[PDB]
Amino acid sequence: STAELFRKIKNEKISFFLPFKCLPAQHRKLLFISFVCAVLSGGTLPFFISVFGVILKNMNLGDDINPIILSLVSIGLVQFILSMISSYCMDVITSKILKTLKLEYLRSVFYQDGQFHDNNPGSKLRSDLDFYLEQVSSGIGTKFITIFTYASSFLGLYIWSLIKNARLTLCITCVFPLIYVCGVICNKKVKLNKKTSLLYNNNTMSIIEEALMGIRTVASYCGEKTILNKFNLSETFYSKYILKANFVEALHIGLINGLILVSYAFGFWYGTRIIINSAFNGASVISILLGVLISMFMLTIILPNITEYMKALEATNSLYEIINRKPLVENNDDGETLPNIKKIEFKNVRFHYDTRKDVEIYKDLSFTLKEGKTYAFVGESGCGKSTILKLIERLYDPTEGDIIVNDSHNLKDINLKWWRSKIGVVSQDPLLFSNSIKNNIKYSLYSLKDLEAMENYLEMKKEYQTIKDSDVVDVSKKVLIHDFVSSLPDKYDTLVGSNASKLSGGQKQRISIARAIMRNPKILILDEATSSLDNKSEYLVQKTINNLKGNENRITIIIAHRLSTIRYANTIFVLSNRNEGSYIIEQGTHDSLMKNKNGIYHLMINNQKAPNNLRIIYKEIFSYKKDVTIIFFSILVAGGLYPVFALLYARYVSTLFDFANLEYNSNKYSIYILLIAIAMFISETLKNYYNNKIGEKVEKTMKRRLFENILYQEMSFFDQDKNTPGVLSAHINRDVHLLKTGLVNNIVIFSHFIMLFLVSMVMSFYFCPIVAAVLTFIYFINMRVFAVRARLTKSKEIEKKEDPSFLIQEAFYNMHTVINYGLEDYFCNLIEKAIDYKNKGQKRRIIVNAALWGFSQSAQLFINSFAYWFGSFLIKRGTILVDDFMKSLFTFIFTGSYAGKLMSLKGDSENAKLSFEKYYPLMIRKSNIDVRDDGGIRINKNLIKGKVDIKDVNFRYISRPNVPIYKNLSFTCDSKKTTAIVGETGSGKSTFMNLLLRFYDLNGEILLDDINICDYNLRDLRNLFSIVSQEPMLFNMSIYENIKFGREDATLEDVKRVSKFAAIDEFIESLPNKYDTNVGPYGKSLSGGQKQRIAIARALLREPKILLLDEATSSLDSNSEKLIEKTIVDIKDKADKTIITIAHRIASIKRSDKIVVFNNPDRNGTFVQSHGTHDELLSAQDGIYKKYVKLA
């Protein structure tokens, strides 16, 4: 509501002048012109309406109308022109301020403190800005000035009507407060139910996602239906509450079209009463009612524009605070500068992350750096040398340390600009621009050449070309890139690729090295200079760096990661942190640091050295007969009895200028209006409600089919990539709500529209055929051939989608490269390439789009005037009477207006019809693995031993049909004896389980009691197993139901019993709602041990004839570990249970009766190698069991 935001803004006092401040003084009054070019056009209707009654008095009495027509059309023309001016003004102003705020935002982005660069990652900002623009590019345009026109019209109409007659309109305007009251009272009761409706939807969302993620656990226990039931029981409440909301939503709508007619009737009635009591004519009564009515219409169209304007205001306040965010590390020029940089001293460098405020990395980084020295440094792959170079560059500052230089001055006194100026940097990867080869090289010295002109006298702009192509030649010859660049065509012309994508990487690193060399730093630094080079080119680069022109004044720090290239070094401060801070463990030269001791550096140098589909829907819709016929009848009644108002209004005008027999006529004609209103109420009520009552059922019978078919689909369908839970949950919600909102909201509208367009047109021919043909021709050539709004919105939206669309995107991925140089060189390379291409097309676009809007506001006036002229023309020569014309006219006009009114309620029809074909196969797609298909032998769960056998297997996934996984497996497990499996970790041990449970089918042969697997009625085959994953999963149901998952019929006492083996049934008796406390989503409200014990209890409740473990106690404490192992051995002691395990401790393997082993000689599969160690013969020959006892 507007009052909400008004009370909000009342206290902070945002300036309503705020968007209009990035403007010169010239645009202060080009704006002001449009103030007066949009108040005059509000004083138009008070003239038309004030002559409206006089025209009718003048036509049905004999006299002529010609002066008033010419008095009117001139005002129409000046309205056209005054409407044409304002568009051209306002759009230009908006484009200007829109450009300028963007160009301020880019600058403010380039002045973040380094920490903020890490806080908000990159392209998010690029995705934010544009969004805010489309909240303000189309929210302060012409639809701001449309306020004042309507306000002026309101004031003029009401006050003129009041001075002409006051008691009448006072007696009329006493019904509209009751509309506002009903509106708020209905809005309350709508929100109160809508929020509960929303509340009962996220539950279903969770039930879908959490169930699709952990899919195979559902298939193993066969717990499909106990999710469907919860889904339906949560869906029904949503349906009923949203229908209760739609009822009140439709009642108010159907009501507002009922009181306006009472207003008309009482108005005319009291008018005739005062006319009779007079002894003020009748021409002064037709206008008062229309004035008071269209006056209070403008208060329904002003407010959305105010909302959008406040929205633009808050959007701009959400951006100027970004532009007014100050960094801590400023690139000012207030800092001083030494003659040259001497003796950069470090001492106790301390710093923590501003995000994580309890983690330190450095303690005592401290050493000296003075000109004329050579060095060599190396760090581990987790040091944070990035932090070191960032602090050299001053992206951050320490917390306790110091950057003392020359033992007299800290870095804070030194100019950051001068500091980065005299530092050549090279980084890890070649992520460079796409301008050209040389332009990455000659633009560097700008960072210094600005100083030639900034402190001297803009001469900076002209000295760009002054740096010629001289140094590229020699700096290319040095790094040996001269050979290649002089070989391929377009030597210094073929640009470095799009975001550095065309040429080789190491050669782009040579370009970076040339940048560092050419910019003439007093301190030339390199970091990861030679990270991934070959031998000879690296050595030549080394020879280039250590012996540049005049190496007596420089500090040639180098950080390589190959240890055969740290040969020369005045000192090698290699460090370690073994964790609250590093410290330099190693100190010395290359020769006196490897042979020093058997230390860390010693180890380092040692190691390296079609239409059917939709008539499905229509078939579904053509079965609920009790709700189709009612909608049909309401459509008939509305379409039939709205036009009757027109020719009941005409007869009431023609009978007004007859002083005789007036009382009876009034008493007879007002009552029909009353009755028609009482019918229209009920019609619009029962029309806008069963629409949604039919919309609901199609959704909640399609969602059922989808979510019921998806569960039974085989596992290979889920193994694919596109079959992701996110997209599959996105479909079921979005496209189904579109099938509701899109389709049935565009089958009723067409029917009602066609009903009106037939009945009104036909019984408009019958009274005056000569006028109707003209009118239809006019509106035909106007709408379907000169669609002003269509062409306007098209020409808008095409060019509103939008080389400023190319440089901006690639200028953020290289945000670390722009800091090497280039801060304003691309502040002033986008202004040009914007302004050059805006205006040249903008002129034509805006002049056309302003003329087309100025035409649209003053078209009905000319048509109406022409109609009145053509009507009073024929009547003079005695061809048609007056009443027939009035009847043929009012019906057409009012019905056209109403038909255009309700037409603007459609929804998205095409995209829903499109998506229905996307997801139609899924509710019908064949899976060829169905738990329901029960053709096969039943597994009676009493005659079972558990003898598994493997004849031969050669299996491979379809995800890659190139990697063999099994090379002729063969082993057995006889009866009620453990068979442990010890092998290489990651060799694919936990895959045979999936084969056994028919998650995949067969290039291999598995037997159960010497019987094939495909003849078992697999529901029962999954009824006598129980697995244990690495981590179980706990759904959002109760602990009672989590344990009872799979088997619905079970007592709480049995749960208390089987919960004893897991030894967890004491913690549960430590809090209220013991077997009722609902765990959180994904089991995030409990521990890991509790989770596994609950999973074990769930597996044991079923009385599983065969057990299948996997990674028993990978992370549990010894207590729960030995309790579990106690359960294992105790349950092995009894018969009637064959167990198979995959352990990682001899503590359990000692009880193994046969220990089968898998090996991986070469990466092409596995096969059995060992059998029968049974803890006695650990290695009579070679094996891995010896390894897994001597390591254990």
Ligand SMILES: O[C@H](c1cc(C(F)(F)F)nc2c(C(F)(F)F)cccc12)[C@@H]1CCCCN1
């Ligand atoms: O049919 C009515 C209508 C009124 C007026 C008014 F009298 F205010 F100048 N002008 C309309 C115009 C006009 F072009 F502005 F004259 C076009 C279509 C409908 C108009 C309104 C339009 C908005 C939806 C309700 N009917």
